Design an enzyme around this catalytic site. Structure first.
Site, PDB file in Angstrom:
ATOM      1  N   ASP A 187       0.876  -1.174   0.000  1.00 28.05           N
ATOM      2  CA  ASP A 187       0.000   0.000   0.000  1.00 28.05           C
ATOM      3  C   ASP A 187       0.913   1.224   0.000  1.00 28.05           C
ATOM      4  OD1 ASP A 187      -2.431   1.399   0.057  1.00 28.05           O
ATOM      5  OD2 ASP A 187      -2.740   1.091   2.167  1.00 28.05           O
ATOM      6  N   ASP A 206       2.136   2.052   7.951  1.00 30.65           N
ATOM      7  CA  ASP A 206       0.990   1.278   7.437  1.00 30.65           C
ATOM      8  C   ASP A 206       1.384   0.122   6.560  1.00 30.65           C
ATOM      9  OD1 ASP A 206      -1.384   0.182   6.744  1.00 30.65           O
ATOM     10  OD2 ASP A 206      -2.283   1.995   5.853  1.00 30.65           O
TER      11      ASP A 206
HETATM   12  C1  LIG Z   1      -4.061  -2.209  -0.529  1.00 32.51           C
HETATM   13  N1  LIG Z   1      -5.422  -1.689  -0.642  1.00 32.51           N
HETATM   14  C2  LIG Z   1      -5.537  -0.481  -1.456  1.00 32.51           C
HETATM   15  C3  LIG Z   1      -6.154   0.602  -0.562  1.00 32.51           C
HETATM   16  O1  LIG Z   1      -5.284   0.896   0.519  1.00 32.51           O
HETATM   17  C4  LIG Z   1      -6.380   1.879  -1.362  1.00 32.51           C
HETATM   18  O2  LIG Z   1      -5.143   2.373  -1.802  1.00 32.51           O
HETATM   19  C5  LIG Z   1      -5.106   3.790  -1.974  1.00 32.51           C
HETATM   20  C6  LIG Z   1      -5.726   3.976  -3.342  1.00 32.51           C
HETATM   21  O3  LIG Z   1      -7.125   3.750  -3.219  1.00 32.51           O
HETATM   22  C7  LIG Z   1      -5.504   5.403  -3.804  1.00 32.51           C
HETATM   23  O4  LIG Z   1      -5.810   5.449  -5.203  1.00 32.51           O
HETATM   24  C8  LIG Z   1      -7.148   5.188  -5.577  1.00 32.51           C
HETATM   25  O5  LIG Z   1      -7.979   6.289  -5.263  1.00 32.51           O
HETATM   26  C9  LIG Z   1      -7.502   7.534  -5.797  1.00 32.51           C
HETATM   27  C10 LIG Z   1      -8.498   8.566  -5.252  1.00 32.51           C
HETATM   28  C11 LIG Z   1      -9.950   8.224  -5.541  1.00 32.51           C
HETATM   29  N2  LIG Z   1      -8.248   8.505  -3.805  1.00 32.51           N
HETATM   30  C12 LIG Z   1      -9.142   9.353  -3.009  1.00 32.51           C
HETATM   31  C13 LIG Z   1      -7.413   7.449  -7.307  1.00 32.51           C
HETATM   32  C14 LIG Z   1      -6.607   6.239  -7.741  1.00 32.51           C
HETATM   33  C15 LIG Z   1      -7.120   4.970  -7.079  1.00 32.51           C
HETATM   34  N3  LIG Z   1      -6.268   3.822  -7.407  1.00 32.51           N
HETATM   35  C16 LIG Z   1      -4.033   5.778  -3.772  1.00 32.51           C
HETATM   36  N4  LIG Z   1      -3.833   7.145  -4.270  1.00 32.51           N
HETATM   37  C17 LIG Z   1      -3.513   5.640  -2.340  1.00 32.51           C
HETATM   38  C18 LIG Z   1      -3.639   4.178  -1.945  1.00 32.51           C
HETATM   39  N5  LIG Z   1      -3.050   3.941  -0.621  1.00 32.51           N
HETATM   40  O6  LIG Z   1      -7.035   1.643  -2.608  1.00 32.51           O
HETATM   41  C19 LIG Z   1      -6.640   0.530  -3.426  1.00 32.51           C
HETATM   42  C20 LIG Z   1      -6.510  -0.752  -2.614  1.00 32.51           C
HETATM   43  C21 LIG Z   1      -6.065  -1.921  -3.480  1.00 32.51           C
HETATM   44  O7  LIG Z   1      -7.804  -1.057  -2.059  1.00 32.51           O
HETATM   45  N1  LIG Z   2       3.236  11.119  11.507  1.00 30.23           N
HETATM   46  C1  LIG Z   2       2.678   9.923  11.649  1.00 30.23           C
HETATM   47  N2  LIG Z   2       1.402   9.753  11.314  1.00 30.23           N
HETATM   48  C2  LIG Z   2       0.982   8.498  11.520  1.00 30.23           C
HETATM   49  C3  LIG Z   2       1.688   7.443  12.049  1.00 30.23           C
HETATM   50  N3  LIG Z   2       0.897   6.309  12.120  1.00 30.23           N
HETATM   51  C4  LIG Z   2      -0.256   6.698  11.628  1.00 30.23           C
HETATM   52  N4  LIG Z   2      -0.268   8.013  11.228  1.00 30.23           N
HETATM   53  C5  LIG Z   2      -1.361   8.820  10.627  1.00 30.23           C
HETATM   54  O1  LIG Z   2      -2.592   8.169  10.805  1.00 30.23           O
HETATM   55  C6  LIG Z   2      -2.841   7.307   9.693  1.00 30.23           C
HETATM   56  C7  LIG Z   2      -2.588   5.925  10.188  1.00 30.23           C
HETATM   57  O2  LIG Z   2      -3.449   4.996   9.543  1.00 30.23           O
HETATM   58  P1  LIG Z   2      -2.506   3.768   8.943  1.00 30.23           P
HETATM   59  O3  LIG Z   2      -1.276   3.271   9.566  1.00 30.23           O
HETATM   60  O4  LIG Z   2      -2.073   4.313   7.515  1.00 30.23           O
HETATM   61  O5  LIG Z   2      -3.519   2.532   8.926  1.00 30.23           O
HETATM   62  P2  LIG Z   2      -4.686   2.225   7.872  1.00 30.23           P
HETATM   63  O6  LIG Z   2      -5.867   2.394   8.372  1.00 30.23           O
HETATM   64  O7  LIG Z   2      -4.400   0.763   7.477  1.00 30.23           O
HETATM   65  O8  LIG Z   2      -4.488   3.178   6.670  1.00 30.23           O
HETATM   66  C8  LIG Z   2      -1.884   7.745   8.591  1.00 30.23           C
HETATM   67  O9  LIG Z   2      -2.567   8.010   7.373  1.00 30.23           O
HETATM   68  C9  LIG Z   2      -1.273   9.038   9.132  1.00 30.23           C
HETATM   69  O10 LIG Z   2      -2.113  10.141   8.833  1.00 30.23           O
HETATM   70  C10 LIG Z   2       3.040   7.640  12.419  1.00 30.23           C
HETATM   71  O11 LIG Z   2       3.791   6.821  12.961  1.00 30.23           O
HETATM   72  N5  LIG Z   2       3.467   8.929  12.164  1.00 30.23           N
HETATM   73 MG   LIG Z   3      -3.292   3.824   5.635  1.00 30.92          MG
END
Ligand SMILES: CN[C@@H]1[C@@H](O)[C@@H](O[C@@H]2[C@@H](O)[C@H](O[C@H]3O[C@H]([C@@H](C)NC)CC[C@H]3N)[C@@H](N)C[C@H]2N)OC[C@]1(C)O
Ligand SMILES: Nc1nc2c(ncn2[C@@H]2O[C@H](COP(=O)(O)OP(=O)(O)O)[C@@H](O)[C@H]2O)c(=O)[nH]1
Ligand SMILES: [Mg+2]
Ligand SMILES: [Cl-]
Length: 292
Positions: A187, A206
């Protein structure tokens, strides 16, 4: 103010000598909430969810990585955990820094940008090289497709059905799942990457979806062209620095995952009984169908 109080209570209840002096919501996902506690700790929390064994794996991965990575880049190091079907909590010291964004990247000098790309390639090279929680995306998709067929597929429109079938045909014909498998963050988007005061990569968060999976997975967001991500050239340059990887296949993999997204969204809605997601994914199919 209510959420915070409940979570303050739960933290103090499950972690005995832990005293909460301050606590604020610092972020969330659709299924979870993260809190900054005593301006020092992150507590990630989730209640009754689909992935019952979820924080268990994430914790196992942090432990495995903290044992086996040799890197200056910080990742969560779990000090507190409580895990159950109904509730899971992980606590670690907050990784300090500023999250990478397109805006910030565009202020960086060319040299700074290069160093960041090198730092990322470096981190990924090391993680992917570890002697290693398997994930099979093709198989997962097929199972999700079966779930669709068992639930709402027959009620979908022809346009929706065709989008899905067209995707499944592509999935069947691609070779992008036949390459190297390794431990991937899975991710790996810029909202999980932290910069220090010199715009160098200082931490990554994450690893909640991490697992042994296609090597191409960790470049999917680096290659993404969107308002949230830096851009395709960023991901290309990183792939070149990373080395020994077919760039065209990495892009094919990203393009297939991107095509799947609306369907993934629908499936999430079905599994979690959240109609809003079903609707959003279906509407996104129409938007994509009529884009020219
Ligand atoms: C591993 N699971 C990921 C989930 O974390 C989530 O990932 C996001 C992903 O959803 C996000 O991109 C999606 O959404 C983007 C936008 C609608 N985000 C608000 C546009 C591109 C589209 N692929 C990315 N910019 C950031 C990424 N961490 O979405 C896809 C997924 C396969 O479900
Ligand atoms: N600066 C900082 N922000 C964190 C940290 N852990 C979590 N966050 C914040 O809170 C969210 C944590 O959710 P995350 O680890 O990504 O778990 P998720 O729910 O699986 O996406 C992130 O998007 C950051 O905004 C950390 O160690 N440092
Ligand atoms: Mg996250
Ligand atoms: Cl709907």
């Amino acid at each position: 103010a209510t959420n915070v109080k409940a979570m303050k209570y739960l933290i103090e209840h499950y972690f005995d000598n832990f005293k909460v002096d301050s606590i604020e919501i610092i972020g969330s996902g659709y299924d979870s909430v993260a809190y900054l506690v005593n301006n020092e700790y992150i507590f990630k929390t989730k209640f009754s969810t689909n992935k019952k064994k979820g924080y268990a794996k994430e914790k196992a991965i942090y432990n495995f990585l903290n044992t086996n990575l040799e890197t200056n880049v910080k990742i969560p190091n779990i000090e507190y955990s409580y895990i159950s079907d109904e509730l899971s909590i992980l606590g670690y010291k907050e990784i300090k820094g500023t999250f990478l964004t397109p805006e910030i990247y565009s202020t960086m000098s060319e040299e700074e940008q290069n160093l960041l790309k090198r730092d990322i390639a470096s981190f990924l090279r090391q993680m992917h090289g570890l002697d290693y929680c398997t994930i099979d995306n093709k198989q997962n998709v097929l199972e999700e497709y079966i779930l669709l067929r068992e639930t709402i597929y027959n009620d979908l429109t022809d346009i929706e059905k065709d989008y899905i079938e067209s995707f499944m045909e592509r999935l069947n014909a691609t070779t992008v799942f036949e390459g190297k498998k390794c431990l991937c963050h899975n991710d790996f988007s810029c909202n999980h990457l932290l910069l220090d005061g010199n715009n160098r990569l200082t931490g990554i968060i994450d690893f909640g979806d991490s697992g042994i999976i296609d090597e191409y997975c960790d470049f999917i967001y680096l290659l993404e062209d969107s308002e949230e991500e830096i851009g395709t050239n960023f991901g290309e340059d990183i792939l070149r620095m990373y080395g020994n990887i077919d760039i065209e296949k990495a892009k094919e993999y990203q393009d297939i995952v991107e095509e799947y997204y609306p369907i993934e969204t629908i499936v999430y809605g079905i599994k979690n009984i959240k109609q809003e997601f079903i609707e959003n994914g279906r509407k996104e199919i129409y938007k994509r169908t009529y884009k020219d």
